[PDB]
Design an enzyme around this catalytic site. Structure first.
Site, short mmCIF file in Angstrom:
data_model
loop_
_atom_site.label_atom_id
_atom_site.label_comp_id
_atom_site.label_asym_id
_atom_site.label_seq_id
_atom_site.Cartn_x
_atom_site.Cartn_y
_atom_site.Cartn_z
N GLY A 11 67.37 -26.30 7.32
CA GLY A 11 66.14 -26.90 6.84
C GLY A 11 66.15 -27.11 5.34
O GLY A 11 67.10 -26.74 4.66
N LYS A 31 70.35 -19.63 1.59
CA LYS A 31 69.40 -20.49 0.89
C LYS A 31 69.85 -20.72 -0.55
O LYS A 31 70.10 -19.77 -1.30
CB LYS A 31 68.01 -19.86 0.89
CG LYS A 31 66.94 -20.79 0.31
CD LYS A 31 65.57 -20.12 0.24
CE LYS A 31 64.52 -21.09 -0.29
NZ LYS A 31 63.19 -20.44 -0.46
N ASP A 114 52.81 -19.05 2.25
CA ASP A 114 53.12 -20.30 2.95
C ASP A 114 53.61 -20.12 4.39
O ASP A 114 54.63 -20.70 4.77
CB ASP A 114 54.15 -21.10 2.13
CG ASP A 114 54.28 -22.55 2.60
OD1 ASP A 114 53.29 -23.12 3.10
OD2 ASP A 114 55.39 -23.12 2.45
N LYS A 116 54.16 -20.66 8.24
CA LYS A 116 54.17 -21.81 9.14
C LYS A 116 55.21 -21.60 10.24
O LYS A 116 56.13 -20.79 10.09
CB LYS A 116 54.45 -23.09 8.38
CG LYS A 116 55.62 -23.00 7.41
CD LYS A 116 55.71 -24.26 6.56
CE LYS A 116 56.79 -24.14 5.51
NZ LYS A 116 56.76 -25.30 4.58
C1 I1P Z 1 64.64 -29.98 12.27
N1 I1P Z 1 65.54 -29.73 13.44
C2 I1P Z 1 66.80 -30.51 13.30
C3 I1P Z 1 65.75 -28.26 13.71
C4 I1P Z 1 66.14 -27.34 12.52
C5 I1P Z 1 66.65 -25.97 12.96
N2 I1P Z 1 65.62 -25.24 13.73
S1 I1P Z 1 66.33 -24.08 14.82
O1 I1P Z 1 65.21 -23.64 15.86
O2 I1P Z 1 67.55 -24.73 15.58
C6 I1P Z 1 66.84 -22.70 13.90
C7 I1P Z 1 66.11 -22.33 12.75
C8 I1P Z 1 66.50 -21.19 12.04
C9 I1P Z 1 67.63 -20.40 12.47
N3 I1P Z 1 68.05 -19.20 11.78
C10 I1P Z 1 67.60 -18.46 10.64
N4 I1P Z 1 67.91 -17.17 10.50
C11 I1P Z 1 67.45 -16.51 9.42
C12 I1P Z 1 66.64 -17.15 8.44
C13 I1P Z 1 66.34 -18.55 8.66
C14 I1P Z 1 65.53 -19.28 7.74
C15 I1P Z 1 64.95 -20.60 7.95
N5 I1P Z 1 64.21 -21.06 6.84
C16 I1P Z 1 64.39 -19.97 6.02
C17 I1P Z 1 63.79 -19.85 4.58
C18 I1P Z 1 64.09 -18.69 3.88
C19 I1P Z 1 64.86 -17.65 4.41
N6 I1P Z 1 65.36 -17.73 5.64
N7 I1P Z 1 65.20 -18.91 6.42
N8 I1P Z 1 66.84 -19.16 9.78
C20 I1P Z 1 68.35 -20.81 13.62
C21 I1P Z 1 67.96 -21.95 14.35
#
Ligand code: I1P
Length: 274
Positions: A11, A31, A114, A116
């Site tokens: 993301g 990140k 924030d 969400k």
């Molecule tokens: C927009 N689409 C293409 C989908 C995007 C991905 N969505 S997902 O459910 O596959 C999916 C989403 C997240 C994961 N893992 C994961 N672990 C630990 C942390 C994070 C994560 C996400 N933001 C943040 C912001 C700050 C810190 N951490 N942190 N994410 C796996 C899979």
């Protein structure tokens, strides 16, 4: 950073990546972004319902944060569950766990600011954790913004996180975003149209807030039976307390954990398609 190999984009504070530690084979979430100190403080803020901050790497004037990796985010899970909806027992379990996470962070004087679906992470075991916590102190969605923020309050409180969580709660239940605004004023008026335009009676001091205007339209309040139909009365009383206008009247995470709604809470496992 040459110790990590980017796998895929998760993301976009900064951009987040799914990566691999070439010096352990470990999979993590990476990140890429006074600050150094604040960030280092979050690494000690550990709890079962908070995504763990493994390391902080400051190099070449760049800041990198290494987080434990979870399986899926709540936004994707809700979309995947759009046809039948997330089972109530699981919704209740997720709300309970997130309130525990907020109770912990709030006891340490740390707020998220924030919350969400996109920063709420889940695993195959049935757990859910808060991510991107405290960072918010060291196109964007306005759907979960508390009214005091929208009205210009400079020093808001932990109550803003309770408001955001209440909005997410409603969304899991109805499969529809509660207040889907596309601008600050549209967001504010959408809240007003549902909960009624606030006044000095329900919110002492509201008319003297930075961005309040006597010219605001005056809408009447709606019944929650119309707002969240599938939610039972215990769920509705809890939601109403999480959505009180006055930050001082809004329920705390700690008090919420004692609400009748959670007397029969359990920990189901979700059906995740990875
Ligand atoms: C927009 N689409 C293409 C989908 C995007 C991905 N969505 S997902 O459910 O596959 C999916 C989403 C997240 C994961 N893992 C994961 N672990 C630990 C942390 C994070 C994560 C996400 N933001 C943040 C912001 C700050 C810190 N951490 N942190 N994410 C796996 C899979």
């Amino acid at each position: 950073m040459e110790n990590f190999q980017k796998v895929e984009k998760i993301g976009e504070y900064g951009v987040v990546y799914k990566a691999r530690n070439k010096l352990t084979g470990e999979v993590v979430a990476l990140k890429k972004i006074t600050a150094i100190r604040e960030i280092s403080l979050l690494k000690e803020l550990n709890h079962p319902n908070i995504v763990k901050l493994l390391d902080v790497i400051h190099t070449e004037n760049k800041l990198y944060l290494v987080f434990e990796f979870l399986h899926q985010d709540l936004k994707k899970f809700m979309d995947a569950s759009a046809l039948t909806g997330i089972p109530l027992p699981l919704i209740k379990s997720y709300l309970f766990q997130l309130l525990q996470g907020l109770a912990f962070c709030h006891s340490h004087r740390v707020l998220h600011r924030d919350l969400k679906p996109q920063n709420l992470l889940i695993n195959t075991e049935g757990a859910i954790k808060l991510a991107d916590f405290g960072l918010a102190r060291a196109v964007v969605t306005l759907w979960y913004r508390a009214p005091e923020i929208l009205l210009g309050c400079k020093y808001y409180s932990t109550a803003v996180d309770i408001w955001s969580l209440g909005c997410i709660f409603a969304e899991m239940v109805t499969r529809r975003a509660l207040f889907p605004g596309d601008s600050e004023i549209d967001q504010l008026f959408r809240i007003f149209r549902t909960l009624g335009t606030p006044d000095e009676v329900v919110w002492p001091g509201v008319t003297s807030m930075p961005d309040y205007k006597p010219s605001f339209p005056k809408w009447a309040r709606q019944d929650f039976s119309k707002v969240v139909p599938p939610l039972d009365e215990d769920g509705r009383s809890l939601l109403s307390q999480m959505l009180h206008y006055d930050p001082n009247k809004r329920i705390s995470a700690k008090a919420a954990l004692a609400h009748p709604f959670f007397q029969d809470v359990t920990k189901p496992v979700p059906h995740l398609r990875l």
